[PDB]
Symmetry: D2
């Protein structure tokens, strides 16, 4: 279910926005790609969001959780076996979490998906 974590950069704190960059590997053996479920395997939106939420709340907004998706945009499908760069930016002020997925192949780096999510205090 989860991606293989290649590298986890240190958190870059600025004024209000925090940042963490991860290099992830989309494992061909993830249930997301099992032949019994799909013949055109690609990382679905639920998984992309889920991964975003797991890293965002364990590394940037520990006491927060999902409220809503302000906007998501899937530009390129993510296939099994791809290497991804995941950038998460959290602005506790506006309570907005910005994310970005990019596929690294050769010397190229294409954006696969990006979006803004609203989070809320836990048991606020």
């Amino acid at each position: 279910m989860l991606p293989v974590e290649l590298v986890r950069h240190d958190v870059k704190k600025t004024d209000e926005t925090s940042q963490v960059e991860l290099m992830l590997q989309v494992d061909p053996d993830l249930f997301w790609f099992n032949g019994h479920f799909t013949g055109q395997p690609l990382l679905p939106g639920v998984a992309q969001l889920d991964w975003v939420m797991h890293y965002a709340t364990t590394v940037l907004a520990q006491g927060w959780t999902f409220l809503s998706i302000e906007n998501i945009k899937f530009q390129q499908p993510i296939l099994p076996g791809k290497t991804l760069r995941l950038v998460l930016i959290w602005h506790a002020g506006k309570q907005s979490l910005t994310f970005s997925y990019s596929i690294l192949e050769g010397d190229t780096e294409r954006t696969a998906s990006s979006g803004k999510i609203k989070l809320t205090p836990i048991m606020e």
Copy 2:
């Protein structure tokens, strides 16, 4: 991502099997149903498998993990807000995990999906 656990009966041991019955609630707020990812919300197989594996390895086969799907069969779609009975039977001998999902509505109980999964000793 997980279902709301309603009831967890006790493990029922026999010769070489371990059974566990659970009543789960398929929360409408699961990411699996987010409007941004689908208009026809239904519990996908990855989710049905993911849940089967989670309870199985935490309640019946603690030191085991997924190897392969011997056979799965989806008979009825599972909609958001449904109440489900999940029966897991584990035969450590044949190393086979049998599961069964049924939807409870009114006085009825229909099978939604069932299957057999092969598991393997972790770090074996």
Copy 3:
């Protein structure tokens, strides 16, 4: 790709609304259910819309075509081999096409999906 047409009632013209009722059989051999594509076969939204559009413009609004989906609502999945009642109501005034799908089993009739679509004159 199309459903088997069991019965096609006569058009019931009233003041502004024109109607037609079809009984359809969802054939188990439709490409929509091919094992190579889906493991949990069910009639997807595109197909449901396509069928609505095909009957609606060859029987009620001959010189019109799709513009947009004002609202759709999927309440019950449609499985392979089911018998369906399809009701189409067209109000050329408001240029609105209303549709309704219901599954007939035993003495019951559940609504599977319904919605309103806006159409526009062809080559208008």
Copy 4:
């Protein structure tokens, strides 16, 4: 539902096979991509097969129809707005229809999907 036909080369008859090549445009307005049905739009297999069968039976095997999918393989997802080359080869002897989809971008041409289908004489 159908793709926009850009170019249709002539049938290329050899010794035992028949061939036709088409350049198609995957129109962003197809129902296959309607926002109400998906957030990650991509040409599904049902659509890819449906198109293959349509051109094949109207250009190469007029008196034939689908029997079964000997093998299909989806290598690259097809996004809305892409230009595709579709190659169909029909061997009436072995009654096998071979197809191949490739995406044209820049100077590149990647295979998106390919497969072999068995057809049968209609009313045979």
